[PDB]
Amino acid sequence: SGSGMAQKTWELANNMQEAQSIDEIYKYDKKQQQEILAAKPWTKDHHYFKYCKISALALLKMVMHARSGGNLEVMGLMLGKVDGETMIIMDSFALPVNAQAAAYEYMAAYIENAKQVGRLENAIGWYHSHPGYGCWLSGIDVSTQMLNQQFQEPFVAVVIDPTRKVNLGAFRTYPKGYKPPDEGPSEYQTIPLNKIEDFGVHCKQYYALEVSYFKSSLDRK
Ligand SMILES: CC(C)n1nc(C(F)F)cc1C(=O)Nc1ccc([C@H]2[C@@H](O)CCCc3cncn32)c(-c2ccccc2)c1
Ligand SMILES: [Zn+2]
């Protein structure tokens, strides 16, 4: 008696509670992110971030963009958030002259599209390709990333080599005059003879993050 109507109400409650849960999670993440962004712990610690988690969707798009330029470098922006000492990359868009108002109004639509599905994301970094020479930061890249870790902070620098298999680097520059300890050659990389000087010179002015990869519930399509 009322068995059929009970099933419908139970389905409806299940759906209504999912939406409410999604909204609660988004709101908790938003306030938790506004907390750290106002706190700015990365301004005091120079080895703060240690991990970089990249979504399979963001990697797909970045690698696709990287490949499309062939022998020529390519660049774009990355969407994500902070989670303690980890930089999470969830999505990315290619770049791209009056002004870069397009790069600013693209960014807003991505954040907004993600908000709908209850995803909290904002500009977390920039990516670019080194077709054939490896993952590291050129002298010009180190100047770029030092400025980014001043005006765009928190901001990560991703470098993809689409020619040579998973050849990606996630990096953070150290501040001007910061002398750190330890050794950082990590994984060996064969870079050309016409780049080794620029490499070796600047290879101490930044560090590598421990890259990890993930497939989200939404990134399964
Ligand atoms: C974060 C981005 C938008 N950005 N912000 C700021 C400013 F805030 F400082 C400044 C920037 C920014 O365009 N940097 C930049 C610097 C150098 C290159 C080229 C340059 O050397 C030429 C040799 C090849 C190269 C290998 N690695 C970097 N390059 C690029 C760049 C990379 C790929 C495609 C197009 C351009 C961007
Ligand atoms: Zn570069």
Author numbering: 4 to 99, 107 to 174, 180 to 236
Can you provide the manuscript's text about this entry?
The human CSN consists of eight protein subunits (CSN1–8), of which CSN5 contains a JAMM Zn2+-metalloprotease motif that provides the catalytic centre to the complex. CSN5 is a metalloprotease that exhibits deneddylating activity only in the context of the fully assembled CSN and only against NEDD8-conjugated CRLs3038. The reverse reaction, deneddylation, is catalysed by the COP9 signalosome262728 (CSN) and allows subsequent binding of factors that mediate the disassembly and remodelling of CRL complexes. These findings strongly qualify CSN5 as a potential drug target for anti-cancer therapy.
For further optimization, we focused on improving the pharmacokinetic properties of the compound by replacing the hydrophobic aminophenyl group with more polar heterocyclic moieties. The final compound, CSN5i-3, inhibits CSN-catalysed Cul1 deneddylation with an IC50 value of 5.8 nM and shows a good pharmacokinetic profile. Treatment of cells with CSN5i-3 resulted in the accumulation of neddylated Cul1, similar to the effect seen on CSN5 depletion by small interfering RNA (siRNA)31. Thus, CSN5i-3 is a potent and selective inhibitor of CSN-catalysed deneddylation of NEDD8-modified CRLs. In contrast, treatment with CSN5i-3 resulted in the quantitative accumulation of cullins in the neddylated, active state (shown for Cul1, -2, -3 and -4A) and led to the degradation of SRMs including Skp2, Fbxo22 and Fbxo30. CSN5i-3 is a potent, selective and orally available inhibitor of the proteolytic subunit CSN5 of the CSN complex. The CSN5 inhibitor interferes with the UPS in a unique manner by enforcing the auto-inactivation of only a subset of CRLs. To the best of our knowledge, CSN5i-3 is the first potent inhibitor described for the CSN and is the first example of an inhibitor of a JAMM domain-containing DUB enzyme.
